[PDB]
Coordinates of C-alpha atoms and ligand atoms in Angstrom, one line a residue:
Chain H
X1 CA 181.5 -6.8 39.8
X2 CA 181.4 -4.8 43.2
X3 CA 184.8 -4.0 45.2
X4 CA 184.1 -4.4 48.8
X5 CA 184.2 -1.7 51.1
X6 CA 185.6 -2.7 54.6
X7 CA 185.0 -0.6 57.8
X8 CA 186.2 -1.4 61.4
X9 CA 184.7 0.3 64.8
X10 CA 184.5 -1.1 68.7
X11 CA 181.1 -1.4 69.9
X12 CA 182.2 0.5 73.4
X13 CA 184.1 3.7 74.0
X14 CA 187.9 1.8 73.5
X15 CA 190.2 2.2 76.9
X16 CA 193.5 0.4 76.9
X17 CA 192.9 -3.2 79.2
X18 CA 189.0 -3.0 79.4
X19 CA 186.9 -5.7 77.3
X20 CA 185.4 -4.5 74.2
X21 CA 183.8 -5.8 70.7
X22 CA 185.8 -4.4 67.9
X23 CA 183.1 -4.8 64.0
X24 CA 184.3 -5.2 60.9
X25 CA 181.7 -4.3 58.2
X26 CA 182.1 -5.3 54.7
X27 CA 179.5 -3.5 52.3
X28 CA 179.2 -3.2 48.6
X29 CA 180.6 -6.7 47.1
X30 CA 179.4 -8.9 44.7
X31 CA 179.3 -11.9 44.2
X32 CA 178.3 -12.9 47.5
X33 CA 181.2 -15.4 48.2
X34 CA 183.9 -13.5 50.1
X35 CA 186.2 -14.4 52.5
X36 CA 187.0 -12.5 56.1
X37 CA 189.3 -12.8 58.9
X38 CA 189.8 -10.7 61.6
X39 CA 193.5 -10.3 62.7
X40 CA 195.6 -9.2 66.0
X41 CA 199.1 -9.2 65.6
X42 CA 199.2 -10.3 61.8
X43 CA 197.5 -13.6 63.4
X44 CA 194.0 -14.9 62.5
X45 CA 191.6 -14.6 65.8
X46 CA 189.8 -17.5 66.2
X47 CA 185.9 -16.7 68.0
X48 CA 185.1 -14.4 65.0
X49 CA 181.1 -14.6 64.9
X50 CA 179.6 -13.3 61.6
X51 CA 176.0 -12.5 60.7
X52 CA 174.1 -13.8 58.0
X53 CA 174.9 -12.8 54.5
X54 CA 171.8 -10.1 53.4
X55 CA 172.1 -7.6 50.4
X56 CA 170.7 -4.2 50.3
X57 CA 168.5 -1.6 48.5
X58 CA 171.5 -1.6 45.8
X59 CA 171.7 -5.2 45.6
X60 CA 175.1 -5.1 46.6
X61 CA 176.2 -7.8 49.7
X62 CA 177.5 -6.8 53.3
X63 CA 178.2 -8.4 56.2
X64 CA 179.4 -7.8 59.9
X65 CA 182.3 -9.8 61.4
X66 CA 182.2 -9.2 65.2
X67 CA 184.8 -10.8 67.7
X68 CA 185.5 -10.1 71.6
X69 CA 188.7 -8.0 72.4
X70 CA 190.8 -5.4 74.9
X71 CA 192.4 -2.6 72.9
X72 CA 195.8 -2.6 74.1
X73 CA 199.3 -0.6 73.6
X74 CA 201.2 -3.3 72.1
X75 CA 198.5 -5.2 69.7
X76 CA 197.4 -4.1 66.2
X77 CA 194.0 -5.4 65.1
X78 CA 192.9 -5.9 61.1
X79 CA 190.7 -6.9 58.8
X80 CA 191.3 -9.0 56.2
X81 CA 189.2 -9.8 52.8
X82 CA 189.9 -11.7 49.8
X83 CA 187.1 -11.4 46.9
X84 CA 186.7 -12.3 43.5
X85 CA 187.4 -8.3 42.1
X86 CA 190.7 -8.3 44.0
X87 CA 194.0 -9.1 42.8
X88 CA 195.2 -9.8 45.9
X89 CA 193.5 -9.9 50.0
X90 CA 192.9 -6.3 51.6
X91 CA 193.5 -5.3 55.1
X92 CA 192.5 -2.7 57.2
X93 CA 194.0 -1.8 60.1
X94 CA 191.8 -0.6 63.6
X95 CA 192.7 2.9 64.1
X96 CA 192.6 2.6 67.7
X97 CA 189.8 5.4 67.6
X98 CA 186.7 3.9 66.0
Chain W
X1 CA 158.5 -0.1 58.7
X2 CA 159.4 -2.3 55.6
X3 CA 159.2 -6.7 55.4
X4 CA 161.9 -7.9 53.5
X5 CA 162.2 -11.5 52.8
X6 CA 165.9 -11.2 50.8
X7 CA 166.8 -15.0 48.6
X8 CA 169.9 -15.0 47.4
X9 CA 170.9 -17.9 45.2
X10 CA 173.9 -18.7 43.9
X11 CA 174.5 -21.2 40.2
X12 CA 178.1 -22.5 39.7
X13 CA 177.1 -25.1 37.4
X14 CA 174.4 -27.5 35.9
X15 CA 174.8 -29.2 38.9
X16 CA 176.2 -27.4 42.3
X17 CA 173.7 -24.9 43.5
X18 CA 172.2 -23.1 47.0
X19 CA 170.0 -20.7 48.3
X20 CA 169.3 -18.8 51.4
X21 CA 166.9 -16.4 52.7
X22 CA 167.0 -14.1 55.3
X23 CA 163.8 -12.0 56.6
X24 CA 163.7 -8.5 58.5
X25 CA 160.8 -6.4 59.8
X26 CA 162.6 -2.7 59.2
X27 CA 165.9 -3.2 60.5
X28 CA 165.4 -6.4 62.8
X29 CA 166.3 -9.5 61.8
X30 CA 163.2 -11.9 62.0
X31 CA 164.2 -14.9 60.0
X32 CA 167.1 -17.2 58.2
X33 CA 166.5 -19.8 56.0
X34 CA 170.5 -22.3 55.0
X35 CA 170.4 -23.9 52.1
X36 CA 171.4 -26.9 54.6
X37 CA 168.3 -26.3 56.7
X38 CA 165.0 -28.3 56.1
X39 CA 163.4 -25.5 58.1
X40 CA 163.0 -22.0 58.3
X41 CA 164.4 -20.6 61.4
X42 CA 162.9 -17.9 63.8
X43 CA 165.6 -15.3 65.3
X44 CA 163.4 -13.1 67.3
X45 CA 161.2 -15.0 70.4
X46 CA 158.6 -13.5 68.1
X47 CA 159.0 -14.4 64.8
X48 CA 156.1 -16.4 64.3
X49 CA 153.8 -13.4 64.7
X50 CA 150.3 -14.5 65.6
X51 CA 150.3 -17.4 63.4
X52 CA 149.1 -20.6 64.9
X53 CA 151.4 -23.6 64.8
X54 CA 149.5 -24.9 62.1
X55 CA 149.1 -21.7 60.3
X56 CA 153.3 -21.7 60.6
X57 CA 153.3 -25.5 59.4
X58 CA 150.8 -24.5 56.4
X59 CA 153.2 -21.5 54.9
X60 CA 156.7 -23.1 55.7
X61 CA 155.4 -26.4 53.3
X62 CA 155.1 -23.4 50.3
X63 CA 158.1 -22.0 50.9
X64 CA 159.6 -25.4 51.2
X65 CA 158.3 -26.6 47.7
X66 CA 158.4 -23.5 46.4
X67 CA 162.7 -23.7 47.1
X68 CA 162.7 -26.7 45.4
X69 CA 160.8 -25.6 42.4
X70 CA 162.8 -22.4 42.2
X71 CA 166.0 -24.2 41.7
X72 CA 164.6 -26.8 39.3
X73 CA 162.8 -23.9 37.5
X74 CA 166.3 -21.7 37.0
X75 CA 167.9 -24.5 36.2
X76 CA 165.5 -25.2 33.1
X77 CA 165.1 -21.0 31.9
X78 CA 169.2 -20.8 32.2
X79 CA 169.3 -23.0 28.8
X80 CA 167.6 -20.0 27.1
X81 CA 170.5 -17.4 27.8
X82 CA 171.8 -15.5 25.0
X83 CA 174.8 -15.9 23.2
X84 CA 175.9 -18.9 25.5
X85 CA 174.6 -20.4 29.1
X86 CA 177.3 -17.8 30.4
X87 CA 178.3 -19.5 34.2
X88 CA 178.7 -18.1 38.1
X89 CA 174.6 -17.0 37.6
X90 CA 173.8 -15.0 40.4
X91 CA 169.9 -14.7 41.3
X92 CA 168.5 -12.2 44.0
X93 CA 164.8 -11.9 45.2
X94 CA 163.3 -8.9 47.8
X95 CA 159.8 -9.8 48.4
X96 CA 157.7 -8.1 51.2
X97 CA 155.4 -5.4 52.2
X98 CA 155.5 -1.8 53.1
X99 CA 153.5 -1.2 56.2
X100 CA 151.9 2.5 56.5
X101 CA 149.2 3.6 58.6
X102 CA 150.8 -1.5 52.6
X103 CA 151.8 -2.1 49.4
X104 CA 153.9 -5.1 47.9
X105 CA 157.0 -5.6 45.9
X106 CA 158.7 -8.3 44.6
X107 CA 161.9 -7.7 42.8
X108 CA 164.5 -9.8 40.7
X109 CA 168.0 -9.3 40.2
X110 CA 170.2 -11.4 37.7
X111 CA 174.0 -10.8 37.9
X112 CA 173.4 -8.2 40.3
X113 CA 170.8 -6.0 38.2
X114 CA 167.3 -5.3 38.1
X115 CA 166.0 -7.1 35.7
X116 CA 162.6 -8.6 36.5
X117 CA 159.3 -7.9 38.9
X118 CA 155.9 -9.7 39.5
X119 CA 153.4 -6.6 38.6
X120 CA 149.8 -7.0 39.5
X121 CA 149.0 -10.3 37.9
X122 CA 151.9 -11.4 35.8
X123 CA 156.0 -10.9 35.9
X124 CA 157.0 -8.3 33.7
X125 CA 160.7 -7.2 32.5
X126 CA 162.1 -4.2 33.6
X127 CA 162.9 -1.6 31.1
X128 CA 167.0 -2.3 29.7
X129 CA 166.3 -5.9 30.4
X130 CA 168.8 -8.6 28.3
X131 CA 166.3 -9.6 25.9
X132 CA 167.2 -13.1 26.1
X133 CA 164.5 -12.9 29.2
X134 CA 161.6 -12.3 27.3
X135 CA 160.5 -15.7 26.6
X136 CA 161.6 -17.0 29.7
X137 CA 158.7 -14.7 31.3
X138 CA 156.4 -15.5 28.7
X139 CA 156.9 -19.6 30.0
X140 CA 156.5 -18.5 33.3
X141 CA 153.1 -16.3 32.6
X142 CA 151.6 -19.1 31.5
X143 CA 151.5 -20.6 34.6
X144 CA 148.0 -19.3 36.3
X145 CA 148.3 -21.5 39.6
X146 CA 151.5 -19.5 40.5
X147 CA 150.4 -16.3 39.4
X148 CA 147.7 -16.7 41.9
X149 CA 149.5 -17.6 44.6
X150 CA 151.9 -15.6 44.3
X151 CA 148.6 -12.9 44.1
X152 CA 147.6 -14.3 47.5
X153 CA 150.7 -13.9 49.2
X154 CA 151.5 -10.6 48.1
X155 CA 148.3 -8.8 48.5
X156 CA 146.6 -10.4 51.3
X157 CA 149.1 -13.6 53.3
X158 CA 152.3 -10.8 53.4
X159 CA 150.3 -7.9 54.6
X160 CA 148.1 -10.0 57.3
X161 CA 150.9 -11.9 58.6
X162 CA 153.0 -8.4 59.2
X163 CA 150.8 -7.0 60.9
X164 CA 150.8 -10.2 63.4
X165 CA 154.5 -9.7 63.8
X166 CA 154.2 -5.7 64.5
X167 CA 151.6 -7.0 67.3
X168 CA 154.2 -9.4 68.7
X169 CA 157.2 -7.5 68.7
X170 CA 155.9 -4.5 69.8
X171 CA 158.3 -4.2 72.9
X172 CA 161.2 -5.0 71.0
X173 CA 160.4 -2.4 68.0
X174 CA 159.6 0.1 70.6
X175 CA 162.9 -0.5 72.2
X176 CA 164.5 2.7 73.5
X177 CA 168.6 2.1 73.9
X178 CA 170.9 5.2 74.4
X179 CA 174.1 6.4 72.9
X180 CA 177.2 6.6 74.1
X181 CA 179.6 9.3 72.3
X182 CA 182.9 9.5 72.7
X183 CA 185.6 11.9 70.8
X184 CA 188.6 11.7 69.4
X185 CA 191.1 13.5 66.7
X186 CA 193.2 12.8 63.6
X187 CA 195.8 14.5 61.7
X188 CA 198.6 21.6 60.0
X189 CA 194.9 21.2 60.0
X190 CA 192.7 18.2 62.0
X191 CA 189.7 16.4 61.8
X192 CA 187.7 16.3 64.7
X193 CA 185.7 12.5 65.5
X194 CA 182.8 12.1 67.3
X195 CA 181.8 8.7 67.8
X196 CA 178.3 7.6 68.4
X197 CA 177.4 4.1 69.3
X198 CA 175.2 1.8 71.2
X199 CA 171.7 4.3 70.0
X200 CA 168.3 2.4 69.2
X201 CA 166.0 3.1 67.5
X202 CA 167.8 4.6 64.4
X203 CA 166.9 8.3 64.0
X204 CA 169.3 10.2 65.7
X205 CA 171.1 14.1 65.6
X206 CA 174.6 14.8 66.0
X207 CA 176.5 17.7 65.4
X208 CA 179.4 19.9 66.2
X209 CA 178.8 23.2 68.6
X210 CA 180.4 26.5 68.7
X211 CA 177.7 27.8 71.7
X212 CA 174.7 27.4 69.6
X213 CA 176.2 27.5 66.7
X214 CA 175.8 24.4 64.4
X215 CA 179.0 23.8 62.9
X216 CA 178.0 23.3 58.5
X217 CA 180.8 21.4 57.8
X218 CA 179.6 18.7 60.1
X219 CA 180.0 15.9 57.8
X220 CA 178.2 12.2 59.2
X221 CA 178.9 9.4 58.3
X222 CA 176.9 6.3 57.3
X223 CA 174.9 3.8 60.2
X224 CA 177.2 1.0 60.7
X225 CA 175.6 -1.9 62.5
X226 CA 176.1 -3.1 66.2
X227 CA 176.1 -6.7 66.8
X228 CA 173.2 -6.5 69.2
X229 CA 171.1 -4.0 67.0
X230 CA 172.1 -1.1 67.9
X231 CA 173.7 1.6 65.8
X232 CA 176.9 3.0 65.5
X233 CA 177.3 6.8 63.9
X234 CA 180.3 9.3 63.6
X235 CA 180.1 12.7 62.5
X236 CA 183.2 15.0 61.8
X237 CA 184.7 18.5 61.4
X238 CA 187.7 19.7 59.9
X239 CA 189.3 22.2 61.6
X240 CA 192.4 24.6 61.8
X241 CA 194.6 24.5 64.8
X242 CA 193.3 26.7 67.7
X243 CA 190.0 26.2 65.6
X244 CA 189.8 23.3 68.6
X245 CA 189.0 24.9 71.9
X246 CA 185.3 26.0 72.2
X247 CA 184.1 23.5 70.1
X248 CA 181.6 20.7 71.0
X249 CA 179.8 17.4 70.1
X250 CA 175.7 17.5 71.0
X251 CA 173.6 14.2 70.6
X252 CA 170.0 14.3 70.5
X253 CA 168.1 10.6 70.3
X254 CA 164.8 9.3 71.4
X255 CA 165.7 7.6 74.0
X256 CA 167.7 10.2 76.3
X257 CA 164.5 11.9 77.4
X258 CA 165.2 16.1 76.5
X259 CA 168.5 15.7 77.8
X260 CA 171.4 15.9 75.1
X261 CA 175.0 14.7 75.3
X262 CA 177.3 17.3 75.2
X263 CA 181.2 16.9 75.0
X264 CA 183.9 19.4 74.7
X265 CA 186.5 18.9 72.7
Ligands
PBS301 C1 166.8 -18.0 34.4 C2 165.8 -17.0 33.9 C3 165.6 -15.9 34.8 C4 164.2 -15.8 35.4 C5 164.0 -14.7 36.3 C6 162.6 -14.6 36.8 C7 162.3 -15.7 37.8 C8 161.4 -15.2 38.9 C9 161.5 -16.2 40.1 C10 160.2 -16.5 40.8 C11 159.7 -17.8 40.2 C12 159.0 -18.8 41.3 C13 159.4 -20.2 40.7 C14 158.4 -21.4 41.1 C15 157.2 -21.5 40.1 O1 157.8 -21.4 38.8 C16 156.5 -22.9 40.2 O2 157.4 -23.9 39.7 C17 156.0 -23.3 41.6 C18 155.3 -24.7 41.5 O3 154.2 -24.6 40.6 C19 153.2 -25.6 40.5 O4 152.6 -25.7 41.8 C20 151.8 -24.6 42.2 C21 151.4 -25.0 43.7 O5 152.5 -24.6 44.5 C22 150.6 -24.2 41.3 O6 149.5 -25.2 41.3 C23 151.2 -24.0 39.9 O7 150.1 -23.8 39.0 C24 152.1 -25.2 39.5 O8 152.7 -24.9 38.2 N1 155.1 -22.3 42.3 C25 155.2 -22.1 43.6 O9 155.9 -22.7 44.3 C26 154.2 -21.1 44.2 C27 154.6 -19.7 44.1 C28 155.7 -19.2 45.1 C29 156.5 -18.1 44.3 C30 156.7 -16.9 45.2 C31 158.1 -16.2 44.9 C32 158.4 -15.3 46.1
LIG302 C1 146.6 -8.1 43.8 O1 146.8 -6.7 43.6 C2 147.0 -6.3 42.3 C3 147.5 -4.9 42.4 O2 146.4 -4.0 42.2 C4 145.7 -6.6 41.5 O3 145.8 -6.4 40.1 C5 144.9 -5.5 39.5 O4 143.7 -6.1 39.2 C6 142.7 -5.3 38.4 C7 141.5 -6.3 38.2 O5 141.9 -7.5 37.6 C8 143.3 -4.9 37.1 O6 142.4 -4.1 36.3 C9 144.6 -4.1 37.3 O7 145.2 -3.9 36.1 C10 145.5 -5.0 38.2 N1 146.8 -4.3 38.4 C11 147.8 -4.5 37.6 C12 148.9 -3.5 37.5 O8 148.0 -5.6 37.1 C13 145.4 -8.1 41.6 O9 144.2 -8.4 41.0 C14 145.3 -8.5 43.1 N2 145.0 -9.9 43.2 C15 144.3 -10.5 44.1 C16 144.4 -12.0 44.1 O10 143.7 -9.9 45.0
R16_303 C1 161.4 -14.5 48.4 C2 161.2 -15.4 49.6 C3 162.5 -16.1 50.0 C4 162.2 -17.2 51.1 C5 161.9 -16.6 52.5 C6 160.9 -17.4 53.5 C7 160.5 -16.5 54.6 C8 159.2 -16.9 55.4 C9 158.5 -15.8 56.2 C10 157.6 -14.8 55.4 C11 156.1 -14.9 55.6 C12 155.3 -13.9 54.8 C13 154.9 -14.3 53.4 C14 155.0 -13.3 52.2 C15 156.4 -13.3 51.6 C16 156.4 -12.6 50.2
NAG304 C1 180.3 -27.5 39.7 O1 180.7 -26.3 40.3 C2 181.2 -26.4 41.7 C3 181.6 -25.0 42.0 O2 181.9 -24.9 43.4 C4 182.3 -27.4 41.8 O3 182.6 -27.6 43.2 C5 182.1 -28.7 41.0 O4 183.3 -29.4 40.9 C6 181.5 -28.5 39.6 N1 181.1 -29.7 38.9 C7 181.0 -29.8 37.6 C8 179.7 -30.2 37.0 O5 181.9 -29.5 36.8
NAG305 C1 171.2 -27.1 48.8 O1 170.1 -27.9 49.1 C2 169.7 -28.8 48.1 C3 168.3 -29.2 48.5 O2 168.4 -29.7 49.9 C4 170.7 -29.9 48.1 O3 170.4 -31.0 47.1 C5 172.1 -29.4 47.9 O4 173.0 -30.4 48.3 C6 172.4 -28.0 48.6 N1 173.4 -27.3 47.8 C7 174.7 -27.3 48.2 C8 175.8 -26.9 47.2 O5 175.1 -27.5 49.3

């Protein structure tokens, strides 16, 4: 049993009010059944498009959540995974960097 | 470039099982196959390669029988597991070609591990195998039929039809796509970001500059995918305060002609 590895990035240089796609990337699981939301404000996002589940030279799953969103001064975006090998979900928060 | 087809299949029970398949030509994305889909689907205007329609209707009808015997097949071998048919049974298959100026592979993991391969003429266990899979091999060379399809689509159907999608998709594996860094800092010592995004094809240089002077101590980190294909890439320095000023990020990539990005810190 793999524990999953969760990383979280923005597809564009991130400036405060200006439309970007913020990644979540969730690597080395297995099983594959996993379970990911992507969060703003504590609160589940709704148009989070996922890819397809692959695995990879290791055999071990990943998988890229993706959703629209403008990095702001007040909001705090997450991601959130519950799997098998966990005792309870795991978040990671969007350092307002990547 | 390397063709993966990649099945995963997943066995809860005697009775509630799926599978899916998802096929990429190095790192683009060419095919899907749901468990809830008759079908394979093509994700790439070119997925088809130069296959005729008929030569596309021909291959899916294997792969579409071959599913259903797969899961029928499993289903039947599981029975012979040692100590007891042990539940969750997790099955992974990377089947493909690797296309130089090829040669095959078709892998099989069980629970996550490598455990079986097809080899020349026959499947063969792996060395550290769970004994228990002997026999079920031994069933499965005895079926000649198989063992020469499975001969024809690894030496000659895999390689051929490849080389029809390199033909086709030419334009899109030659695409050229150009970074755009950006820098940043963290938290008395610091660690200096520079981020790296947007950049296709994959190879690509980044480092931290003192002049000329490569910073050792660069430290990059690992490709993280873009949702339109492109790659994403940081690379980082720790440094001391007043270690800062003088310091800079250079990017070299394919596409960006002979003409670097350089940010100062
Ligand atoms: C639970 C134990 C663990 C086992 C781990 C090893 C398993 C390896 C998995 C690969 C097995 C393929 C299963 C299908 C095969 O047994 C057979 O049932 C069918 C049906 O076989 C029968 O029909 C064919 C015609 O399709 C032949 O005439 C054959 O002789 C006949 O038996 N053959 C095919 O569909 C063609 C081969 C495609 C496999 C390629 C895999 C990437
Ligand atoms: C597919 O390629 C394999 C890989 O070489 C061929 O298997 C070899 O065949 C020769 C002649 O039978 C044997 O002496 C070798 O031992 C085989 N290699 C191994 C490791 O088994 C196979 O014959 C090819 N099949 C087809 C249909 O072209
Ligand atoms: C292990 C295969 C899983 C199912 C994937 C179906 C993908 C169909 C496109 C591939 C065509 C090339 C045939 C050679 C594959 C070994
Ligand atoms: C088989 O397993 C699946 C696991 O998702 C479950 O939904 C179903 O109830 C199970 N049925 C049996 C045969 O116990
Ligand atoms: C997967 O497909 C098979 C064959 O179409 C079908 O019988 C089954 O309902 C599917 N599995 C699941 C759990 O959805």
């Amino acid at each position: 049993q793999k524990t999953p590895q969760i990383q979280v990035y923005s597809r564009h240089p991130p400036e405060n009010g200006k439309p970007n796609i913020l990644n979540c990337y969730v690597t080395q699981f297995h099983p594959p059944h996993i379970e990911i939301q992507m969060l703003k404000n504590g609160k589940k996002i709704p148009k989070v498009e996922m890819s397809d589940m692959s695995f990879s030279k290791d055999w071990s799953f990943y998988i890229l959540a993706h959703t629209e969103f403008t990095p702001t001064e007040t909001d705090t975006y997450a991601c959130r995974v519950k799997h098998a090998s966990m005792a309870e979900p795991k978040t990671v928060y969007w350092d307002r960097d990547m | 470039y390397t063709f993966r087809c990649l099945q995963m299949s997943s066995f809860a029970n005697r009775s509630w099982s799926r599978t899916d398949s998802v096929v990429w030509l190095g790192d683009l994305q060419t095919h899907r196959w749901s468990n809830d889909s008759a079908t394979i689907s093509f994700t790439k205007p070119w997925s088809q390669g130069k296959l005729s329609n008929q030569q596309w209707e021909k291959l899916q009808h294997m792969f579409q029988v071959y599913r259903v015997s797969f899961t029928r097949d499993i289903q039947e071998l599981v029975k012979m597991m040692s100590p007891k048919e042990d539940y969750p049974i997790e099955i992974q298959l990377s089947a493909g070609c690797e296309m130089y100026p090829s040669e095959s592979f078709l892998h099989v993991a069980f629970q996550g591990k490598y455990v079986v391969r097809f080899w020349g003429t026959s499947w063969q266990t792996v060395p550290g195998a769970p004994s228990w899979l002997d026999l079920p091999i031994k069933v499965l060379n005895a079926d000649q039929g198989t063992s020469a399809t499975v001969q024809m689509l690894l030496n000659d159907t895999c390689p051929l039809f490849v080389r029809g999608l390199l033909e086709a998709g030419k334009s899109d594996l030659e695409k050229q796509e150009k970074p755009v860094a950006w820098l940043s800092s963290v938290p008395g010592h610091r660690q200096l970001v520079c981020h790296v995004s947007g950049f296709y094809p994959k190879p690509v240089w980044v480092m931290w500059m003192r002049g000329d002077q490569e910073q050792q101590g660069t430290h990059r980190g690992d490709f993280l995918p873009n949702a339109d294909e492109t790659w994403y890439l940081q690379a980082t320095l720790d440094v001391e305060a007043g270690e800062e000023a003088g310091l800079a990020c250079r990017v070299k990539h394919s596409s960006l002609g002979g003409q670097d990005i350089i940010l100062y810190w």
